[PDB]
Design a protein around this nucleic acid. Structure first.
Ligand SMILES: [Mg+2]
Ligand SMILES: [Mg+2]
Ligand SMILES: [Mg+2]
Ligand SMILES: [Mg+2]
Ligand SMILES: [Mg+2]
Ligand SMILES: [Mg+2]
Ligand SMILES: [Mg+2]
Ligand SMILES: [Mg+2]
Ligand SMILES: [Mg+2]
Ligand SMILES: [Mg+2]
Ligand SMILES: [Mg+2]
Ligand SMILES: [Mg+2]
Ligand SMILES: [Mg+2]
Ligand SMILES: [Mg+2]
Ligand SMILES: [Mg+2]
Ligand SMILES: [Mg+2]
Ligand SMILES: [Mg+2]
Lengths: 147, 186, 103, 134, 125, 52, 118, 52
RNA sequence: AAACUUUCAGCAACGGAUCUCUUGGCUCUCGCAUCGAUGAAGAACGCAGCGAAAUGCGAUACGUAAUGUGAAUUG
RNA sequence: GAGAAGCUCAGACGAGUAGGCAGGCGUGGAGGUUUGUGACGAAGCCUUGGGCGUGAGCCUGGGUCGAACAGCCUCUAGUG
RNA sequence: UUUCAAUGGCCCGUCUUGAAACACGGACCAAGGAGUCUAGCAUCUAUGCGAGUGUUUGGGUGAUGAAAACCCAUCCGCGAAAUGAAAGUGAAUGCAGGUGGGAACGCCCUUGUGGCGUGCACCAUCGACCGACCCGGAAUGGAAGGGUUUGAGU
RNA sequence: AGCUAAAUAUUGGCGAGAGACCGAUAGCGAACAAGUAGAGUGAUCGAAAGAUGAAAAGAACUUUGAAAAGAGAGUUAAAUAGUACGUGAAAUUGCUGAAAGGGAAGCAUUGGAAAUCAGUCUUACCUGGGUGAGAUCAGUAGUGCGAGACUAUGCAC
């Protein structure tokens, strides 16, 4: 609020904190971010390297839906299943193994970070990393690919 | 005249919390007394951390607590873990061990999973009753420099820190000054 | 000029933007108007349902084809197989989508 | 059952109907609650906090009434929370002795015997006839 | 408390509507209580005053005086009562206006329309 | 209780809502400071006021 | 309330307020780049500073050792029942003549000194 | 002055519910009622509950 | 010693600050869709017992018919 | 007890423009509170009287006057 | 309070190395009179919740009286994964590693600024793991083996 | 080649309800006979200006004056409200009083002189002394078992 602002403290101080020598003039080094290559270079090159110039290919009319593929790691796979399903299968010996459909949890690829418990599980996913598939198979489970 | 040069004149530390939480004031009242009427460094540690800001009191999860108290050469088997801060859950830890934890706050998920595994959750005043000087306690802290700002602090030529950018991708600070093919690299 | 920490500024305010500022002080008023229109319409068409029945269709693209949502109207083949003439469908609140087909 | 007395003081130490605070003289505070014999704003003298507390009010036309708080089982029943004993028509020596007995010899608020006697003394001095000087 | 969306509690609007009221509206604004005997007889609490009505003054320096209403100065929201005057400098007597709310009617100037107004207002003749 | 729920039981009229927990279990800190478990391990009290 | 000393009894008037009617007497810190007063040249007026603060024991006390407590009604005077030797009652300017009599009477009953009696 | 000054303030739903929970809990405390100016010296019980 | 000049106070001037007020403004929201060759918007000139500016009106001229109210208008 | 935001004992120290921070003073309006002030005189104003504060300022006697106005915790700004 | 005497006291504001200046503004008084609000960004603090978080695009109690309060679904934003121009690929040898300092705690001395054992945070450091790049390298795939390197990673 | 409701817009117009807005140098330029008075050939430009009192009760009459007016009177709660009207600041001015003054004045420090202001003391509480009258006080008796406070019936006279 205005009552606690520094402006209230500067009443009676003639220059309002902006100096008597240099003052608070209108734009003395230009407007916006103009001058990054000339008189602002020492700032741009120190705090925003890479700013000027071109890198890489253009892609006309990018549409991000065909590229959609959020990822989940192995250490989160069992968290996608309800608590009742975990209690029924996790750590037990059952004829059936739970199905974890990662796509209905909002993921397009299963990645391999972390570890799995030693119970069989069926992982339904569009994509899977190589190391993720190896660790699923070591736990006795399988990856079945879907669309 | 006197020729005195004064550098460390005013102490730079907090003498009280910035928080207006009345219950935090009650905890400070308890630990002002305990840190004064005992010779325990534990109680002075708790009093000091009760003053600290949110960023200086990072959270810790029950996974980190379980890992820190279960080292091969630990002997931290049946001792109460204490953090002046929030204890979060780590859902990646599928099976939670039996833990005794004293904390300012517990997340609802953290508290439920600690109790369900047979452990116990205490507030810091309950801790003061059980271990008035912090004996046989594991005093723990979360990771101070895990927050986002520490990715950026110290950015400069060849410092390998993260820039402040509105967006990530090519066209966003990956050109002249960031690669050899564009003048120079960093 | 630029000397502080943070992102290089990007603000798109070089046109006469204050001329075309849109405020939302009428947001509760619009909400009340729309609810009153629904109540007025419901009493007028009663006992017909306020909403017509819609088909279930799969959204396009790989991002949403795992889901199901309401579509515009039933296909000519769907109406044929359910024994409903397309001219009769509208008279009893069944929308007809001549564009959608059953692949 | 109980909401803490420390917590109540934290809520009302700077905000209550019975506190008269002024900025003059560098910030003075007066407490006016009926069960505050000392009249000073502090946790130990506030009747709104303490389970056991006393107040000495004036009784018309003579004497004082001793106000005390009943056993904390009535903390949620304000009609049964306050006990008002009229110590009137007694002399000054008789009145102070009864206050000391009811508050101190019972172990109720032994810390508040001196202040209560002083407050009763001042009220009794205010009730005496005026020797108006024509 | 009011609840109608068609009622304004704006002080500005109420004052504008009162002081800007047209002649026929000011007639209802200048109403007086009926006397106790008249209230029971006609089952009516109050009426717009009228010339040739009989009143007694209930408030002010002229409290307790009685007389006919000689004129209803609606432009000033004032009643002129017979023999209620004051002396000018030159000896002439100037009538003193009294607010309609500050008198009580003790005898009505009954006539065809007034009789119709009593029955319409739920009263009796 | 159906409006607010409890700390461990969800409110029926507020989906997924639980009452907050406090950071101090017993707010009677004066009692704790003067309790047996505390007073039996503290050092000797020390002077509240000292002569000049 | 014993041996009340004032370090200064003059009020610290604003520089040049004696020369221009537009410049009020209330103290302002001179901030001019050439100000002789700010630089404390000999023979110029003094400026208020913390060294002039009075003894914490006797600060705010009137000459009689009491501090003038403002009272607007009888119940304000009743606040000074136990504090008879530290506070005097100052009756507010906007209190009516009737209420003022009742206040003077109540103070006399309690032995509270009234600064502005009459 | 402009109309597009920010007039309304958003509070997190959970904090709003926390605030109301605190306010209801305070209504159960006779000292806080008296401190807030309510003349409740004679009421039989706090919370005060009457028949339907 | 006066006169004179200067400062302060009382009183008297000059001036219209201050305070209180407010049939006005500003802003928001809700609702509504109706100009004109059947001559509009705008302009001019006239009209009242005593009326120049405003309101109103048009040689039927601060208005005629019709409807409602029901004793005023008012300097 | 000593507003634990309290109480108590001790030592050293004190220039300041530009500039930085803190704690305060004063103004319009909003919520809360104060059996708050007021036609038996609110607010405002004058003063050759009194008091308080290092200061911003505050309280008060006398005069004038005529309808409203203030303290305390918060909110807020077209606030000196 | 006024006045007198003695002693001291140049005209304020400003730009300036430097103003009493023969530098500029200022005859007088009242009232008005200048760091704001908005879209962002950054640090710091407080509060809520926390691997999540965000009821106010919307819809409902709703008609009573309702621009508030209060409630409610699906999306979506930001976060939970990086790297590469891209096609793509995508994070545990080990107690999620070793070394040094180190908070807190425990144990031994014997009155020392002690020794011993765990070791949070943080910093320095040696590795491992993912992506890019550079290698050899036994139609399509790049598995094991490597690298002085490289990334806003683990 | 063609038509089409709704959900959308709305600083104009009309009608309505509000506001942590402004409060007569503010708020629209205009609270008032304001797009008026006034300026300019013209396009255009464009103000200032609210408040007696509850009610005119707006000062009869006498007197002095050529008159305007004055003085008596009168009305009013008030003329310290007289339309040049609520309050009525400052600059600026007259009168009266006080004081000072050899080519400025003002200020600071310290005292003199003169003027002016406050102490209300020794009140409270305690004891002693003189006389006086009086339902009379310590331990007890009885009415929640042990100990402690209180009131209440009597005795203690
Ligand atoms: Mg400048
Ligand atoms: Mg320069
Ligand atoms: Mg002083
Ligand atoms: Mg200094
Ligand atoms: Mg304002
Ligand atoms: Mg007054
Ligand atoms: Mg003066
Ligand atoms: Mg002082
Ligand atoms: Mg301003
Ligand atoms: Mg000199
Ligand atoms: Mg300089
Ligand atoms: Mg200069
Ligand atoms: Mg120059
Ligand atoms: Mg110049
Ligand atoms: Mg000049
Ligand atoms: Mg001003
Ligand atoms: Mg008057």
């Amino acid at each position: 609020p205005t009552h606690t602002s520094k402006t209230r403290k500067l009443r009676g101080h003639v220059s309002a904190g902006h100096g008597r020598i240099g003052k608070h003039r209108k734009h003395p080094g230009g407007r916006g971010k103009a001058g990054g290559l000339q008189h602002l270079r020492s700032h741009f090159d120190k705090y925003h390297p890479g700013y000027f110039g071109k890198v890489g290919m253009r892609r006309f009319h990018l549409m991000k839906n065909p590229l959609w593929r959020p990822t989940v790691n192995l250490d989160r796979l069992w968290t996608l299943v309800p608590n009742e399903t975990r209690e029924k299968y996790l750590g037990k010996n059952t004829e059936v193994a739970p199905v974890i459909n990662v796509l209905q949890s909002g993921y397009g690829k299963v990645l391999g970070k972390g570890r799995l418990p030693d119970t069989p599980v069926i992982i339904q996913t569009r994509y899977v990393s190589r190391r993720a598939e190896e660790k699923i198979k070591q736990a006795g489970g399988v990856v079945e690919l879907i669309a | 005249g006197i020729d005195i040069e004064r550098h460390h004149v005013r102490k730079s530390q907090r003498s009280k919390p910035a928080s207006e939480n009345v219950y935090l004031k009650l905890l400070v009242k308890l630990y002002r007394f305990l840190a004064r009427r005992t010779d325990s460094r534990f109680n002075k540690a708790i009093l000091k951390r009760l003053f600290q800001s949110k960023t200086n009191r990072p959270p810790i999860s029950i996974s980190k607590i379980a890992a820190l108290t279960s080292r091969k050469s630990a002997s931290l088997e049946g001792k109460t873990t204490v953090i002046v801060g929030t204890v979060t859950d780590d859902e990646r830890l599928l099976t939670v061990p039996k833990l005794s934890v004293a904390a300012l706050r517990f997340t609802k998920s953290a508290r439920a999973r600690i109790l369900k595994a047979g452990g116990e959750v205490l507030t810091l005043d309950q801790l003061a009753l059980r271990a008035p000087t912090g004996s046989n306690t594991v005093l723990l802290r979360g990771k101070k420099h895990a927050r986002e700002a520490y990715r950026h602090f110290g950015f400069g030529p060849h410092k390998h820190k993260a820039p402040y950018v509105r967006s990530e991708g090519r066209k966003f600070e990956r050109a002249r000054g960031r690669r050899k093919s564009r003048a120079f690299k960093v | 000029a630029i000397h502080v920490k943070g992102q290089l500024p990007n603000a798109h305010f070089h046109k006469d933007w204050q001329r075309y500022v849109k405020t939302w002080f009428n947001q509760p008023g619009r909400k009340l108007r729309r609810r009153q229109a629904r109540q007025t319409k419901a009493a007028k068409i009663a006992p017909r349902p306020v909403e017509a029945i819609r088909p279930a269709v799969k959204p396009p693209t790989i991002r949403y084809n795992m889901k199901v949502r309401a579509g515009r109207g039933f296909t000519l083949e769907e109406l044929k197989a359910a024994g409903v003439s397309r001219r009769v469908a509208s008279t009893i609140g069944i929308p007809v989508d001549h564009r959608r087909r059953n692949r | 059952m109980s909401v803490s007395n420390d917590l109540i003081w934290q809520v009302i130490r700077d905000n209550n109907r019975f506190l008269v605070k002024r900025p003059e003289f560098g910030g003075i505070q007066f407490n006016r609650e009926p069960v505050n014999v000392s009249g000073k704003n502090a946790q130990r003298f506030s009747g709104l906090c303490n389970d056991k507390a006393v107040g000495v009010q004036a009784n018309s036309p003579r004497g004082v009434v001793l106000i005390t708080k009943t056993n904390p089982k009535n903390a949620q029943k304000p009609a049964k929370l306050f006990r008002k004993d009229v110590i009137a028509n007694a002399s000054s020596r008789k009145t102070y002795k009864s206050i000391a007995g009811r508050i101190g010899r019972t172990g109720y608020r032994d810390d508040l015997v001196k202040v209560s006697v002083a407050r009763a003394s001042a009220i009794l001095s205010s009730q005496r006839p005026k020797k108006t000087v024509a | 408390m009011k609840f109608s969306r068609d009622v304004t509690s704006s002080r500005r609007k109420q004052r504008k509507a009162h002081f800007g009221a047209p002649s026929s509206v000011r007639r209802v604004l200048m109403s007086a209580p009926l006397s106790k005997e008249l209230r029971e007889q006609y089952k009516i609490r109050s009426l717009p005053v009228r010339r040739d009505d009989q009143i007694t003054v209930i408030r002010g320096s002229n409290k307790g005086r009685e007389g006919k209403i000689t004129s209803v100065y609606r432009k000033k929201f004032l009643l002129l009562i017979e023999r209620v005057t004051r002396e000018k400098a030159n000896g002439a007597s100037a009538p003193v206006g009294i607010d309609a709310s500050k008198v009580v009617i003790t005898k009505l100037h009954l006539d065809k329309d007034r009789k119709d107004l009593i029955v319409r207002k739920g009263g009796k003749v | 209780d159906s409006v607010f729920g409890s700390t461990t039981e969800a409110a029926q009229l507020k989906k997924n809502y639980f009452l907050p927990e406090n950071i101090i279990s017993n707010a009677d800190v004066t009692r704790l400071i003067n309790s047996d478990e505390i007073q039996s391990i503290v050092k000797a009290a020390g002077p509240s006021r000292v002569k000049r | 309330a014993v041996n009340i000393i004032k370090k200064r009894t003059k009020p610290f008037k604003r520089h040049q307020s004696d020369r221009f009617k537009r410049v009020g007497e209330s103290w302002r810190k001179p901030r001019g780049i050439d100000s002789c007063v700010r630089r404390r040249f000999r023979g110029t007026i003094s400026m208020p500073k913390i060294g002039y603060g009075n003894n914490k024991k006797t600060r705010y006390c009137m000459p009689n050792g009491l501090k003038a407590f403002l009272v607007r009604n009888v119940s304000d005077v009743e606040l000074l029942l136990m504090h008879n030797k530290t506070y005097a009652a100052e009756i507010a300017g906007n209190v009516s003549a009737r209420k003022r009599v009742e206040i003077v009477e109540k103070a006399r009953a309690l032995g509270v000194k009234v600064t502005n009696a009459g | 002055t402009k109309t597009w000054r920010k007039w309304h303030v958003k509070v997190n739903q959970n904090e709003k519910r926390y605030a109301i929970s605190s306010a209801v809990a305070a209504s159960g405390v006779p000292s806080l009622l008296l401190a807030r100016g309510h003349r409740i010296e004679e009421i039989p019980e706090v919370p005060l509950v009457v028949d339907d």
